[PDB]
Amino acid sequence: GNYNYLYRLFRKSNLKPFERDISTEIYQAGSTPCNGVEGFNCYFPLQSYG
Amino acid sequence: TKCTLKSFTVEKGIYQTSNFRVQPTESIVRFPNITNLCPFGEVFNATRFASVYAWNRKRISNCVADYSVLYNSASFSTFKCYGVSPTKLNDLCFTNVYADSFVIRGDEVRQIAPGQTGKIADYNYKLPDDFTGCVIAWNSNNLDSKVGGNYNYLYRLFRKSNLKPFERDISTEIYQAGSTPCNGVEGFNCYFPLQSYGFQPTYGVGYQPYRVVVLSFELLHAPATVCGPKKSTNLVKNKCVNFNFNGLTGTGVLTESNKKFLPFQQFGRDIADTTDAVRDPQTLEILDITPCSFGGVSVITPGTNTSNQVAVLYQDVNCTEVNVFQTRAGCLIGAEHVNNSYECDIPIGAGICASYQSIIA
Amino acid sequence: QCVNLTTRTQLPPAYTNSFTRGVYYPDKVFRSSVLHSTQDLFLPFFSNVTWFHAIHKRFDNPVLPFNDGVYFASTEKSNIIRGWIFGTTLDSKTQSLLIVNNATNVVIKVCEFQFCNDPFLGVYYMESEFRVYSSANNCTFEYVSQPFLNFKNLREFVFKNIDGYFKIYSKHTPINLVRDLPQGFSALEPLVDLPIGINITRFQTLLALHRSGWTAGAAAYYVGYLQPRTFLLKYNENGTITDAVDCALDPLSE
Ligand SMILES: *[C@@H]1O[C@H](CO)[C@@H](O[C@@H]2O[C@H](CO)[C@@H](O)[C@H](O)[C@H]2NC(C)=O)[C@H](O)[C@H]1NC(C)=O
Ligand SMILES: *[C@@H]1O[C@H](CO)[C@@H](O)[C@H](O)[C@H]1NC(C)=O
Ligand SMILES: *[C@@H]1O[C@H](CO)[C@@H](O)[C@H](O)[C@H]1NC(C)=O
Ligand SMILES: *[C@@H]1O[C@H](CO)[C@@H](O)[C@H](O)[C@H]1NC(C)=O
Ligand SMILES: *[C@@H]1O[C@H](CO)[C@@H](O)[C@H](O)[C@H]1NC(C)=O
Ligand SMILES: *[C@@H]1O[C@H](CO)[C@@H](O)[C@H](O)[C@H]1NC(C)=O
Ligand SMILES: *[C@@H]1O[C@H](CO)[C@@H](O)[C@H](O)[C@H]1NC(C)=O
Ligand SMILES: *[C@@H]1O[C@H](CO)[C@@H](O)[C@H](O)[C@H]1NC(C)=O
């Protein structure tokens, strides 16, 4: 498994053309705020291809 | 005016240069009452759930479904969708929903997935490779488990062939582990296919019973009866707003109407097929839609060799909605109205003319 | 339970004139004092509509092709006509639509029914006889609603199957004419749109027997067929359709 290539699974909004997002901030996927901490409906945006 | 005429010198006269717009201030979306809710309370929070070989299928149709309450609930330990998005469930519309409810072991919760191979996937509940919908699962150790062991939840352990997607098998045929003939008589190599779970409160996480509801969506040529909830805002009148009434959108001033609709009629049209009357879906009242006060902005000037003073005419615009004078042509700003009568130099209209002597009208 | 009715008197079906009936509102749009030309499934003016009787011994419950739409006219007293039978093969192989009005409410069901050859209801002189089906296997849609209902009542209905939508338009009219359809104008309001999504090519009226064998109460009904054409509809100040022009009837109305 080559896990060195990653894609942004989660984001709040669609990008502009020629826009790059490298920010490793947590995503809030539910009603509960995450406060930078993983948990219920709190996921890392970058997941690796298997 | 110099920009419009593409010249640095402007001859004496009146020049239509721009178009005054009353900009829309608010957005008013009025959608009717969110009634006839889908019965998710009798599926997720029923009295007794079914086994996985005989999973209960509830048909959700002809109702409006509030997936936001289901998604915002923190009791669910697993909320995984495979064909849709969780945040777009309240926006999309589907023909019908199949809700498959059962109880499994905590280690088999991952086995309800497309492309996943397991005993529950092959023999108890199978999902297709192009599955759409969401799988929801939550722990039920406080309810289903019994200190003497809950043996009521059975599961199929053996079958000759794998399941088709969304296929049930409640048959109790004795499996043939070997090649010996079995006529339904159990032997050394012939066992009953349905075994009972060992749900007890002393087991850890992974052997506790998990209640799973799987929602599958159908998008056939049948009408989309199942839709998400509609969040109607408050109604604002007498202002140029963007109205959205039951899918009919536009921009206008919504005032009270004296037109008495018949109860089956919703919108109103004039001779020229423009929507000038409408019914609010929340409260059954009739509203006139007056178009916002668009007008032409005209610039009245003498020659730039003479002077740089200008006057602005807003055509068909009242002077309270923009040296201010009200004419039948419109509102004239920057010209001093006088009681004397002269010959017409620059025509304004409706008997009004402008001249330079400052600019008088 | 099914019963063959074998005491009928043989008689050919009748035909009569539609006059200016069968008009309905094409849309949900209010229009005031304006003339609107519209292209839709409309009933032709002065057309040949099929006339069926229930008199004593006449009991007219055949199965007719639905075509593109059905205009049902009913010169009704004492509520003999109670509902309709909608489908393609009218057996358990396909899926059929049932519209019934019994003594309490109206029930609309889309299921796999096994229809009898002679389906009816019955009133004993108290309603205590239901013989319209023998089974109901796979239901997809159920809808219980408020009741729609010398000849004293005139009931006009338009049934349409467009894009999986079943439109029922209806109008109640107080008349005092004895035998035929009265001549006049009455635009049919839209009553209910049904999300059925099923194929329908045949229909059958449901009547009610009178028991005191069986006796047929005095009723008469009319079947007309909807054709794609243009009407010029007149909308008054109050917004009701008071007159119409059939653009393909004669050169004057053209
Ligand atoms: C009422 O009459 C109809 C018409 O004959 C009967 O329908 C037939 O019933 C026989 C009975 O075996 C079948 O073999 C035929 O195939 C049926 N014909 C059709 C067109 O379906 C009906 O059975 C009679 N009702 C009762 C209660 O006997
Ligand atoms: C049970 O589940 C239903 C799902 O619709 C929910 O509305 C209800 O509030 C739940 N019961 C409790 C006590 O939370
Ligand atoms: C819909 O909701 C509004 C909310 O104020 C209420 O007044 C009204 O009676 C409800 N029902 C209908 C049929 O409009
Ligand atoms: C209506 O049809 C019948 C037979 O189909 C025919 O005998 C009759 O003349 C027709 N009526 C008119 C007015 O044409
Ligand atoms: C509907 O039924 C008729 C006859 O029952 C058939 O000819 C037609 O093809 C059917 N239409 C569809 C879309 O199945
Ligand atoms: C009318 O039909 C409905 C549904 O079939 C039933 O619930 C009701 O009891 C019926 N009423 C009478 C008087 O038979
Ligand atoms: C329809 O009913 C028959 C018997 O009642 C049954 O075998 C069949 O599976 C049913 N089909 C559906 C789609 O419900
Ligand atoms: C329209 O309604 C008014 C009642 O407001 C009535 O007086 C008038 O006669 C009606 N006109 C028509 C043509 O129906």
Numbering used by the authors:
A (entry chain C): 447 to 496
B (entry chain A): 299 to 620, 641 to 675, 691 to 694
C (entry chain B): 14 to 69, 77 to 145, 153 to 176, 185 to 247, 257 to 298
Wording from the paper:
The structure shows no significant global changes in secondary or quaternary structure as a result of the mutation when compared to the previously published structure of the spike protein ectodomain with an Asn residue at position 501 (referred to here as the “unmutated” form).
The most prominent mutations are in the spike protein, which mediates entry of the virus into cells by engaging with the angiotensin converting enzyme 2 (ACE2) receptor.
